[PDB]
C-alpha cells in the first residue's frame, strides 16, 4: 500500500498529533507556546508500524510555558496573534514496544 487519509476524528492521530506538537514545544526556544491551528493534510500508511504524516498549520500564543494559566489561556486567545508556521510532520507508533517515534519535522 501506500499512504491514505486518516479522518480527523481518529484518535490515532489524534495521539500522533499531540505528540508532534509537544516535541515542537520543547525543541523551541521560544517563551511562548504554539498552537495547531488547522491540519492541512493528515495521512497514515501501514509499514509494519503505523507511519503518520501530518502537515499542520501552527500559531503563536501568549501564553508561556511556564504559566500554569497555560491550557485555559490557550483555548482562550483563540482568534488574534503572531505568526502562522506550517509544518509537516511525519510520527511513526511501533504498537508492539508500545512506542511513538517522531522521524522528521519540517517547518517553513
Known sequence: G???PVDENDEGLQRAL???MA?????SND?????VVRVISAKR???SGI????????????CPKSSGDLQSCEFHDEPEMAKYTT?????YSIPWLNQIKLLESKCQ
Open 31 to 35: 517563551k511562548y507556546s504554539s498552537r
Open 45 to 47: 500508511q501501514l509499514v
Open 51 to 62: 507511519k503518520y504524516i501530518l502537515q499542520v498549520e501552527i500559531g503563536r500564543t501568549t
Open 87 to 91: 509544518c509537516t510532520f511525519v510520527v
Open 23 to 27: 516535541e515542537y514545544n520543547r525543541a
Open 18 to 20: 499531540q505528540f508532534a
Open 2 to 4: 501506500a499512504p491514505v
